[PDB]
Assembly symmetry: C3
Homo-oligomer: 48 residues x 3
């Protein structure tokens, strides 16, 4: 029973980690988009 509960806890931790990574990927993509947009502004500005 003890090893079962140990393994169960570990797999709970992994699923939580996998979701943390998912959130990090989300925020990383947004940041990439924003920085691309921000650079597009500059590229628009240096033609004004």
């Amino acid at each position: 029973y003890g090893i079962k509960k140990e393994i169960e806890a570990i797999k709970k931790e992994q699923e939580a980690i996998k979701k943390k990574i998912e959130a990090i990927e989300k925020e990383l993509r947004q940041l990439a988009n924003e920085t691309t947009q921000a650079l597009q502004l500059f590229l628009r500005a240096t033609t004004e």
Copy 2:
């Protein structure tokens, strides 16, 4: 004993992973702040 040492190693790996993720979140936040600041400069420049 073998399974104990296996589980122990796995939980050592998880704690290390959790800290890696922590460091990634730190650097991601800094990068977001810097990019916001960098864009704020531009927004300041196109009013000069």
Copy 3:
């Protein structure tokens, strides 16, 4: 055998996670470089 296969699966998941984190670090570094370059452009532009 069951616990062995469980532990084996968990360690497979950890290696996959470690590589996901590796890819995230790669993309995070690139993004930092690009944002630095993008800001360098602006710093070049406001001297023209």
